[PDB]
Amino acid sequence: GITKASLATESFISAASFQETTRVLTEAAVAGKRDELRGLKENVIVGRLIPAGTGYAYHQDRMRRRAAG
Amino acid sequence: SVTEFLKPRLVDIEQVSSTHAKVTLEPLERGFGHTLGNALRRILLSSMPGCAVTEVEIDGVLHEYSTKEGVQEDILEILLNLKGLAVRVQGKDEVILTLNKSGIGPVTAADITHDGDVEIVKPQHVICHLTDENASISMRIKVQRGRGYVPASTRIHSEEDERPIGRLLVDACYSPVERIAYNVEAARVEQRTDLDKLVIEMETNGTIDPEEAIRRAATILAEQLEAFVDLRDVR
Amino acid sequence: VTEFLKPRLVDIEQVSSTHAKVTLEPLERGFGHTLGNALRRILLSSMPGCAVTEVEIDGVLHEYSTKEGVQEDILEILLNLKGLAVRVQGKDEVILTLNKSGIGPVTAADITHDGDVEIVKPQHVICHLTDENASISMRIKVQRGRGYVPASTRIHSEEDERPIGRLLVDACYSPVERIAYNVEAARVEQRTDLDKLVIEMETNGTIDPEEAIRRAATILAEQLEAFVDLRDVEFDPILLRPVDDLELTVRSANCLKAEAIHYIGDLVQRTEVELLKTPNLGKKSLTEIKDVLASRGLSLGMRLENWPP
Amino acid sequence: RDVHPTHYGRVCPIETPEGPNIGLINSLSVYAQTNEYGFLETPYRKVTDGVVTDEIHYLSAIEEGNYVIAQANSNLDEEGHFVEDLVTCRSKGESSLFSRDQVDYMDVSTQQVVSVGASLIPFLEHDDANRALMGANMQRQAVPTLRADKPLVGTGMERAVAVDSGVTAVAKRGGVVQYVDASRIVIKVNEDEMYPGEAGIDIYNLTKYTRSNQNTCINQMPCVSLGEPVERGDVLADGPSTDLGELALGQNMRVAFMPWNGYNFEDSILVSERVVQEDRFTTIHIQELACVSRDTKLGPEEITADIPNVGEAALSKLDESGIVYIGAEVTGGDILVGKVTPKGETQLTPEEKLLRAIFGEKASDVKDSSLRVPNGVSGTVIDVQVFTRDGVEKDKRA
Amino acid sequence: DDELPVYQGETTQTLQDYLMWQVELTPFTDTDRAIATSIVDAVDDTGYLTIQIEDIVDSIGDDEIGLEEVEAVL
Amino acid sequence: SVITVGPYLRLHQCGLPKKMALELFKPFIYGKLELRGLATTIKAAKKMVEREEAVVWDILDEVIREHPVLLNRAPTLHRLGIQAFEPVLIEGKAIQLHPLVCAAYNADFDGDQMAVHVPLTLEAQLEARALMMSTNNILSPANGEPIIVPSQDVVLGLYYMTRDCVNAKGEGMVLTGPKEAERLYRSGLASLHARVKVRITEYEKDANGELVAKTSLKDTTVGRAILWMIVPKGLPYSIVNQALGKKAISKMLNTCYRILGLKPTVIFADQIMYTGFAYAARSGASVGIDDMVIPEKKHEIISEAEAEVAEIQEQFQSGLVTAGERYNKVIDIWAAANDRVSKAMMDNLQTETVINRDGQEEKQVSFNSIYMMADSGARGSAAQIRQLAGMRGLMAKPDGSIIETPITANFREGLNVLQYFISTHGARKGLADTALKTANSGYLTRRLVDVAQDLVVTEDDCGTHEGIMMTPVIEGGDVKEPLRDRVLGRVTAEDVLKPGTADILVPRNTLLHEQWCDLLEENSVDAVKVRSVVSCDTDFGVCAHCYGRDLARGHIINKGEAIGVIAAQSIGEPGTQLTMRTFHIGGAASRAAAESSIQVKNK
Amino acid sequence: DIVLNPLGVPSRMNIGQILETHLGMAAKGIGDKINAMLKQQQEVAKLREFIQRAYDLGADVRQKVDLSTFSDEEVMRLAENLRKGMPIATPVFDGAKEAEIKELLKLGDLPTSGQIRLYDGRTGEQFERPVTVGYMYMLKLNHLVDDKMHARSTGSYSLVTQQPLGGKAQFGGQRFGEMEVWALEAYGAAYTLQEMLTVKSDDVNGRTKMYKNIVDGNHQMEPGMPESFNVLLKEIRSLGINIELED
Amino acid sequence: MARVTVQDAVEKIGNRFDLVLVAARRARQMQVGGKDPLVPEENDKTTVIALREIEEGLINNQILDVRERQEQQEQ
């Protein structure tokens, strides 16, 4: 139902910056969750290319670094 | 710096095939683009010496619409093909040619009787494709000199008094110039920004070099005003 | 026997000082409109003129001030001078001066007479004086020109700054004002379809009509020249100084000449990693040329552009 | 936000800010007034029988609904009876036709619904109300130009606004004009209106070029001639955007409706160079800049003659006192007033004594602090004020 | 917080800031940029004083790097 | 800076104010200065651009050349709201924006202002050329249909060029080429008319990768012919022969894009722009109070309605037809009066203008100015005319009711103090909707974005056979959306069958485009199974065979696009214009038809 | 003087414009009669007759001014005062009817329709179709681009967050806001988006490297981490939550 | 030779996002150094040079890979 569905996103960085920040960060601080940086808002806020578009190429290259080790 | 004005230093010419040419002159004083262009354009189409077909005499059927013994093409189209035919003429103002062709295959402009004064630019222009049979065609095309473009609005309608029937006058295209379009673009010199780059796009049927046509029209307009420059800088 | 016919300037008719008509009798089918239009645009576009340019006056230090006992603001007086029309002979600069005192209007007649300078309206108003004991004295600078040249553009002359109290005004130059024309059938009856062009001009009184027409068509006719024949189809890096005068002593100069280096630039772009290895330089001479060339140029690199020699 | 039916001739339904405060900020209607109790009341003509008496009564919104009120624009006769037997009126929250004998009131003028802002706009009928609504707002944010042109078509309202707005100079107790001039206008008053033993005449000093809160000119220029009789209420000067007592906010322009080569496309607008030559639409702008010279921990600050580390070039436009000559053309970071701020205790060692010896110290600890013009601003100096302190011994050009 | 003009700052430029900006843009080597950064801090709001030279040279901790290198760069 | 119009200046360009660059490009300039050798040091460069003389303007040109800039405006609603251009330096303080893009930006010229930004680097410049330049995207990545479409005076000029008229000298001439320019420019003729028979070559794409010339003599008009000089080969003449209104022209750039691709259409547009302006200006199209023609009948219908309503209200005086029903009744009278007065003015402003060839009345479509303006599709609408000439109609009270007595006056005659004061109610009520609409709209797009951003498009194919069955939308009052419009693009789940058993027109899965949709259009197929997202092709990505057309460029969507955000802004972009809330949209009466009886439009 | 686009007028339904033009036209017309008349040195009597005849035109109109009350000069005065146009005044809702405007306008030998033949200025050719010409009364609004055009390249920043300053005068740079990012993402252009976010706002080392490479002709980015993220990490560390970046 | 439209270079390599990568990697070479253009320069910037070489079919991902292996093998 689309606001519920935003706030429920795996990445705690987005959805923190959508609506409710106190709540978000408290669920995340108690739980100990890691962001993984896999979407477009996180990448923006960290300042890195977005997994899309021209930068999409470049997130495959790095992703192949994770699978290969 | 008064009475000192700019002249174009570019006057470049860039041409497509023989008969299409596009010249650019830069720079010009602001406002002169329109001025010179419009005058040249005006002149080229309004008034210019040339010669075309002002009448055609076809055997048999004298009506403007008819079967015409199975030419496969209505005589509207023949008269229209005879309209775009390019002809050169000598000293004599009026001249009439005849053509007779039979057999099979299209009728080009080479089958026309050859006279010293008349000069045909290309045979490629086709009057009619006739029809496959034992059949012929005989007609007398007429050309005279003229100026401009004189349609069949008048062309001396003669008020039906024509003795030897025939007729069916054709719109005559004298001025040997097909399209002229000018255009006016920003030019800049030093820090002064507002100037004129005039572009002339000019497409001609043949018989005259485009650029040389431009030349001509300029001499006509220049020749009109030569009354007035006698006071200032006559020599 | 087609040829053509050339028009002739005939029957100039003068309604008033400003308003006039000029008729061009023998014109062909489509020439009416041709020459009519062209002539109009050359007339309104350019034509020479005499406008006031600078006015300096004893009262007032700038344009927004007012003088005691004139009615107007100095702005308004500028605008009245704007509108002053005057012709003059050979002289293009022509400074002129006017003085006056006592109650009443100051007209253009108050301008001190000059031989070659001629005022077309003596009754043109400039200011006023409200009471006696007040005078005006001003010096107006009237020059020749062609288009509309603002004050704000013309200051590009720069050089020495003009002194305080010199007022500058926008110059409008060209007297021609409004211009119409129409073409109408000719009465010659020798050949029908001949027509004639009349032009109605209204000017400030500066230009005579025959000279106006005349000029216009000269300008136009001179403007067609390349149409008569269509034809055809510095910046340098500031320093050539020989390396000899930089005082390299002995070794460094010869080590620079061993690479066949002349002047500066060809020497100035090299990385120290590229220069460090050649015979005889060592670490000392590199710092020596670093010190010498540290002054002046400073560079020790660019990609630059090209070379004149 | 919404227009309620009692705003009838009290507030206005057209003049309102189009921005996100909409219907919030309203404007009094023309003939509107206010009670002792603080309530909006509006005038009406009193109708007894079916003749309209010229007595007027101000009705409050509660008082108004009880009665029947006719329409501003309706017919009428020399006798004062309505022409048409069924007259469109208002009752309570409504409107509909009533008989001749029913309606006791009438609206005075047609201007009642509209505010003064919109009371200025010709042909406001033919305009849609929202679009009317913009233009009423736009006549506010116009800007007065060098010469004021009277509007050539107009409502009649312009005399009131001008002379009420109090931007014009109006003559009290009038008579023949003794002396005239740009900045000053005196009236020798008639012998009739005068206070005995004061005698004398009346003087009016016009205000020349003066910043306005929106950094635009205020300028008064005398209408009257000399040796001319004047009665009380006639305008001696015009303020800015005024012509002979009319309100003239713009200029008249010969307009042609027709598309022209795409230059007028969408809501754009193509203009003859004539207009720019003739200088209509040229507007003045006066901008204030201030310099203040003050006492610090390190001692007092002084203005000018002379400055450290500054060329003669830059100082050429200044005076003996250091303020710029009135009349100077100033651009860019030319120095409008210079000023020095002393620093702490430079004493000794050979280099300090050497610089003090060579250059005469050049006033030493002072710094460069001055009134330089803001970069990208321009213009002549029209006036300088220079308020001083008592007992500073200012002298110079103060 | 934000959306208002809090007194966050101006970030003005002093003389040492500007000199360092000017060093950033000039063709210095890796070392020469270290000597340059070493000198521009030695400079004062008064200009002239670059204080002691031989402490500029000795501050680098020998290892070569003569006096002449700091002199030219200087 | 502020925006002005760009009326030369081709699509991929942008008038950038001279003074304003020179700043934006500072670093770049100093680079060039140091290369040429005009400055040895940074301070020198700096000083010469501070002094801004001479060489510097010359170098500015050299700096700007081919360096794409990007402009951006205001609320950016969709991705089009920022686009990239090649600047052309122009002395001025304002930015000139080409007309055609004014659509996208939603910008008029009433004092709108644009931001400008400078891509640096290389990557960024290339992303500006090959993504945001205005010549890449001519099609709206929502509906898919062209933007760029000519509006407003371009429309009026084409529509004026191509008309028929009765008589108008030089009628029934036969000419070839035509070119026909000769003859309009020379007088000789009137472009609106003559119904001149002209011979024309076609160049059809009938043969694959080849243009077969077909020529013939057609009956058409001069301005048609004239306009044909622009159309770039590969299209039929029949596209330019017709009254050629607004719609017509969108379709014509659409067909051009589809048939002959991007490159000749982006030029073809330009050209259309120019010839539109041209001719429209020649036409002298103006507006004048006589252009608003109030029908003589209006007085009579309004009097009849005043009599009817008088009858009903007298019945109320007699006790009959209580005000409850009388209210709806009187509404039903004055609304029918509205429709009849409207019909009268529309009948009078169309047609008429009867010219004469020998029979004295051929009864031709009107050339009235305001009529041409609405008819062309350039500005305005029939409803909007009715306000100027016929009745204004029933006024909406701010409580959502209707006042019994409508406004009987058009704006040609003015409104009454009372009626204007009533108009006011609804005017202001409607101004104050746009406020609310901005806030709520944007908050909506905000949330949509927020939810939808993670969507990416990663794997190429998925292989799922699930899908959605696709049909027309039929309801009462025939069908609003035809099944080709729904199934266009997309891709096919399982197969399709002809109305005959075991006959397939498409294999496996296929990309369905204009050709395939013609195949499906000519056959009787009323339902097509189509695979789509949300059937979860793949894992994280929504693979491209679901999904399946990018809109914008008409090929299938390439791998690695967003989709997320495109959807959100596509959904949300509209709604700025929406009914919003609190309307019953009744129009006639509150009481339902109460008739359960069905009816059919066709057999 | 000034040319305006008919296509404004139907959609917006403000017809004051058009009636303004027409009555304006007719207003100048009378002043043109008088202009031409005084310029020909006509007698005072005839001038009196044409102004009197002008004032009194229209149905009703309640303004009874007539001459003969004021005599000799006073009439010459006003006439010279109205030489430039006659100032007609139409009050709000009792204003002048079209009929009265055509009537007024026929006295000025102007065409009743208020449209006139105009000629092109370049080509000299008549526009097809007549055109409305008319005096309309314009204003210049307080919005001027001199106050508007800004442009910055590199200027002063903010101490915290280290971003450029707000506005012109102070040299803002130009908010590049969330919708504007969305539009770039939507294009899929991630480099342009990446230099916006960093290098040209809050990446400090990267702004320097950027500008130095630009001056040198490198056009390469060397992106880093924007200040403002670092700040956020300190501000969340200021509650008892750690947030750290794990490799 | 300013490029209004990239389509011609997009047919060469699908998905323009790829084009932009290849274009800029090729343009970088000429921009910074250690390459010369395969196509006659029309005075245009290096970016357009690169897109032209892609439109001509002289440069692509594979070609730049082969040139990289050739330059690494020759060094």
- Give chain B's end-to-end CA distance (angstroms, integer): 21
Q: Do B36 and C144 touch (CB under 8 A)?
A: no
We report the CATH number of the domain holding residue B131 as 2.170.120.12
H and G make contact (3+ CB pairs below 8 Å): yes
Is F602 at the interface with chain E, CB within 8 A?
no
In sequence order, the β-bridge partners of residue G131 are G116
Whole-number Cα distances in Å, B137 to F244, F495, G166: 44, 63, 87
Mutation site, G119, G120, G123, interface B, largest B CB count within 10 A: G123
Please tell me whether residue D356 adopts helix, strand or coil conformation.
Answer: helix
Q: Do C290 and E71 touch (CB under 8 A)?
A: no
- Give chain E's end-to-end CA distance (angstroms, integer): 45
Same-domain pairing of B28 and B14: yes
Residue F69's φ and ψ, nearest 5 degrees, are -100, 170
Please tell me whether residue C90 adopts helix, strand or coil conformation.
Answer: coil
In sequence order, the β-bridge partners of residue C128 are C105
Which tokens is F177 given? 């080429």
Q: How far C259 CA sits from the closest chain E CA (Å)?
A: 22
Q: Chain C residues with CB inside 8 Å of E68's CB?
A: 287-288, 290-291
Q: Do D22 and F435 touch (CB under 8 A)?
A: yes
CB-based contact A15:A45 (threshold 8 Å) = no
Which tokens is D219 given? 């300028």
Is H6 at the interface with chain F, CB within 8 A?
yes
H and A make contact (3+ CB pairs below 8 Å): yes
CB-based contact F377:F247 (threshold 8 Å) = yes
* B129/B111 Cα distance (integer angstroms): 13
* E69/E35 Cα distance (integer angstroms): 9
Chain centre distance of CA F70 = 24
Q: Report which secondary-structure segment, H or E, holds H68.
A: helix H61-74
Is B224 at the interface with chain C, CB within 8 A?
yes
DSSP letters for C177-225: BEEEEEEEE----SSTT-EEEEEEEE--SSS-HHHHHHHHHHHHHHH-S
DSSP category for residue B164? T
Same-domain pairing of C140 and C6: no
Q: Chain F residues with CB inside 8 Å of D18's CB?
A: 431
CB-based contact C176:C199 (threshold 8 Å) = no
Q: Do G142 and D214 touch (CB under 8 A)?
A: yes
Nearest to G21 by CA among F417, F291, F384: F291
Nearest to B201 by CA among B84, B86, B40, B49: B40
DSSP-derived pairing of the beta strands D270-271 and F69-72: unpaired
* D72/D103 Cα distance (integer angstroms): 13
What is the Cα gyration radius of chain H?
12
Nearest to F481 by CA among F472, F469, F490: F472
Same-domain pairing of C84 and C108: yes
Domain span at residue B165 reads: 50-174
* F323/F313 Cα distance (integer angstroms): 9
Count the helix, strand and coil residues of chain C and give each as a percent rounded to the nearest 5.
25, 25, 50
* E52/E50 Cα distance (integer angstroms): 7
* G167/G147 Cα distance (integer angstroms): 12
* G25/D223 Cα distance (integer angstroms): 27
DSSP-derived pairing of the beta strands D169-170 and D153-154: unpaired
Residue in G122, G124, G217 closest to C33 by CB: G124
* D353/D365 Cα distance (integer angstroms): 13
Q: Which residue of B has its CA nearest to F229?
A: B179
Q: Chain F residues with CB inside 8 Å of G182's CB?
A: 76, 79, 449, 565, 568-569
Interior CA angle at D251 toward D248 and D255, to 5°? 140
* D38/G234 Cα distance (integer angstroms): 57
CB-based contact B51:B88 (threshold 8 Å) = yes
Q: Do H45 and F122 touch (CB under 8 A)?
A: no
Which tokens is F58 given? 């010359």
* D215/D288 Cα distance (integer angstroms): 8
* G170/G119 Cα distance (integer angstroms): 50
Q: Which residue of D has its CA nearest to F102?
A: D266
- H residues 11-30 near A, CB within 8 Å? 17-18, 20-21
* C42/C175 Cα distance (integer angstroms): 12
The domain boundary residue, chosen from C232, C256, C271: C232
Interior CA angle at C119 toward D272 and C59, to 5°? 85
Which tokens is F597 given? 């009886």
Q: Other CB atoms closer than 10 Å to residue C123's CB: what's the count?
A: 9
Q: Which residue of F has its CA nearest to E27?
A: F41
Question: Per the annotation, where are the binding residues of F for Zn(2+)?
Answer: 462, 536, 543, 546
The type of residue at B110 is A
Same-domain pairing of B194 and B154: no
Same-domain pairing of B74 and B170: yes
* F288/G10 Cα distance (integer angstroms): 11
Segments of F289-444 assigned E as strands: 396-397, 401-402
Which tokens is H36 given? 């010369």
Whole-number Cα distances in Å, D230 to C149, D174, D176, D187, D189: 44, 5, 6, 8, 9
Q: How far G156 CA sits from the closest chain E CA (Å)?
A: 6
Is F8 at the interface with chain B, CB within 8 A?
yes
Q: How far E63 CA sits from the closest chain F CA (Å)?
A: 31
* F433/F497 Cα distance (integer angstroms): 50
CB-based contact F329:F365 (threshold 8 Å) = no
* F186/F63 Cα distance (integer angstroms): 46
Is B43 at the interface with chain C, CB within 8 A?
yes
We report the CATH number of the domain holding residue F324 as 1.10.132.30
* C128/H22 Cα distance (integer angstroms): 78
DSSP category for residue D296? B
Same-domain pairing of B161 and B212: no
CB-based contact F44:F168 (threshold 8 Å) = no
CB-based contact D140:D247 (threshold 8 Å) = no
Segments of chain D assigned E as strands: 33-34, 40-48, 51-60, 86-90, 95-99, 153-154, 169-170, 177-179, 184-187, 202-205, 221-222, 235-238, 242-243, 246-247, 251-257, 270-271
Same-domain pairing of B1 and B64: no
DSSP letters for B87-116: EE--S-SEEEEEEEEESSS-B-STTSPP-S
Same-domain pairing of C61 and C166: yes
Same-domain pairing of B115 and B229: no
Is B34 at the interface with chain G, CB within 8 A?
yes
The domain boundary residue, chosen from C153, C173, C193: C173
Q: Which chains lie within 8 Å of chain A at 3 or more CB pairs, if any?
A: F, G, H
- C residues 148-177 near D, CB within 8 Å? 148, 161, 164-165, 170, 172
Q: Do F55 and C235 touch (CB under 8 A)?
A: yes
Same-domain pairing of C308 and C220: no
Please tell me whether residue F15 adopts helix, strand or coil conformation.
Answer: strand
Quoted resolution (Å): 3.4
Q: Other CB atoms closer than 10 Å to residue D109's CB: what's the count?
A: 19
Q: Name F118's Cβ contacts closer than 8 Å, sequence gap at least 6.
A: F24, F25, F67, F69, F70
Please tell me whether residue D370 adopts helix, strand or coil conformation.
Answer: strand
DSSP letters for G98-116: HHHHHHHHHTTT--TTSEE
* B114/B97 Cα distance (integer angstroms): 8
* F52/F21 Cα distance (integer angstroms): 12
Is B223 at the interface with chain C, CB within 8 A?
yes
CB-based contact G105:G114 (threshold 8 Å) = yes
* F161/F152 Cα distance (integer angstroms): 15
Q: Which residue of H has its CA nearest to A58?
A: H21
Nearest to C259 by CA among C273, C282, C280: C280
Residue in C62, C69, C79 closest to D382 by CB: C62
Write the CATH number of the domain with boundaries D29-109. 2.30.150.10
Question: Per the annotation, where are the binding residues of F for Mg(2+)?
Answer: 108, 110, 112
Q: Which chains lie within 8 Å of chain F at 3 or more CB pairs, if any?
A: A, B, C, D, E, G, H
* F152/G1 Cα distance (integer angstroms): 23
Q: Chain E residues with CB inside 8 Å of C291's CB?
A: 68, 71-72
Nearest to C252 by CA among C271, C278, C227: C278
* Dihedral over Cα of B200, B203, B204, B208: its sign: positive
CB-based contact F457:F563 (threshold 8 Å) = yes
Q: Other CB atoms closer than 10 Å to residue C172's CB: what's the count?
A: 19
Q: At what angle do helices H16-32 and H46-56 cross, to 10 degrees?
A: 130
The type of residue at H6 is V
Mutation site, B42, B77, B184, B192, interface F, largest F CB count within 10 A: B77
Q: Report which secondary-structure segment, H or E, holds F444.
A: helix F417-452
Which tokens is H12 given? 């060469």
Q: Report which secondary-structure segment, H or E, holds G38.
A: helix G16-39
CB-based contact G165:G172 (threshold 8 Å) = yes
* D17/D21 Cα distance (integer angstroms): 6
Same-domain pairing of B160 and B54: yes
Q: Chain C residues with CB inside 8 Å of D219's CB?
A: 73
Same-domain pairing of B54 and B154: yes
Mutation site, G7, G115, G133, G136, interface F, largest F CB count within 10 A: G7
Is G146 at the interface with chain C, CB within 8 A?
no
Length of chain D: 398
Is G6 at the interface with chain F, CB within 8 A?
yes
Is-cis flag, bond preceding G39, omega within 30? no
Q: Other CB atoms closer than 10 Å to residue D90's CB: what's the count?
A: 22
* F476/G160 Cα distance (integer angstroms): 63
Task: Give B58: exposed, middle or buried? Use CB within 10 Å, 0-12, 13-18, 19+.
Answer: buried
Q: How far D47 CA sits from the closest chain F CA (Å)?
A: 20
Is H35 at the interface with chain G, CB within 8 A?
no
Q: Which CATH class is domain D167-241?
A: mainly beta
Q: Other CB atoms closer than 10 Å to residue D331's CB: what's the count?
A: 12
**D347-379: burial string, b at 16+ Cβ within 10 Å, e else:** eeeeeeeeeeeeeeeeeeebeeebbbbeeeeee
Question: Per the annotation, where are the binding residues of F?
Answer: 108, 110, 112, 462, 536, 543, 546
Write the CATH number of the domain with boundaries D282-392. 2.40.50.150
Q: Which chains lie within 8 Å of chain E at 3 or more CB pairs, if any?
A: C, F, G
* G179/F81 Cα distance (integer angstroms): 10
CB-based contact F293:F345 (threshold 8 Å) = yes
H helix intervals, G121-203: 145-148, 178-187, 190-197
Segments of G47-107 assigned E as strands: 88-89
Which tokens is F242 given? 């017709």
Residue B85's Cβ-side half-sphere holds a number of Cα atoms within 13 Å equal to: 34
Domain span at residue F337 reads: 289-430
Please tell me whether residue F533 adopts helix, strand or coil conformation.
Answer: coil
B and G make contact (3+ CB pairs below 8 Å): yes
* D211/D290 Cα distance (integer angstroms): 14
Whole-number Cα distances in Å, F230 to D184, E5, F273, F276, F390: 69, 56, 11, 11, 40
Is D167-241's fold the same as D282-392's? yes
Nearest to B214 by CA among B172, B184, B182, B173: B182
Residue F468's φ and ψ, nearest 5 degrees, are -125, 135
Q: Other CB atoms closer than 10 Å to residue D137's CB: what's the count?
A: 17
Q: Do B227 and C4 touch (CB under 8 A)?
A: no
Method underlying the structure: cryo-EM
Can you say whether residue F74 is alpha, beta or left, with left for phi > 0 and alpha for psi between -120 and 50 degrees?
Answer: left
Q: Do C298 and E68 touch (CB under 8 A)?
A: no
C and F make contact (3+ CB pairs below 8 Å): yes
Q: Other CB atoms closer than 10 Å to residue D203's CB: what's the count?
A: 11
CB-based contact F472:F573 (threshold 8 Å) = no
We report the CATH number of the domain holding residue H15 as 3.90.940.10
Chain centre distance of CA E27 = 15
DSSP letters for D115-173: BTTGGG-TT-TTB-HHHHHHHHHHTTSB---SSPPPPSEE-STHHHHHHHHT-SEE-SS
B and E make contact (3+ CB pairs below 8 Å): no
Can you say whether residue C164 is alpha, beta or left, with left for phi > 0 and alpha for psi between -120 and 50 degrees?
Answer: beta
If one counts the domains in chain H, the total is 1
What residue has token string 């770049």?
F28
Q: Chain C residues with CB inside 8 Å of F44's CB?
A: none
Nearest to D58 by CA among D116, D112, D22, D110: D112
* E3/E5 Cα distance (integer angstroms): 7
Please tell me whether residue B139 adopts helix, strand or coil conformation.
Answer: strand
CB-based contact D323:D386 (threshold 8 Å) = yes
Please tell me whether residue B176 adopts helix, strand or coil conformation.
Answer: coil
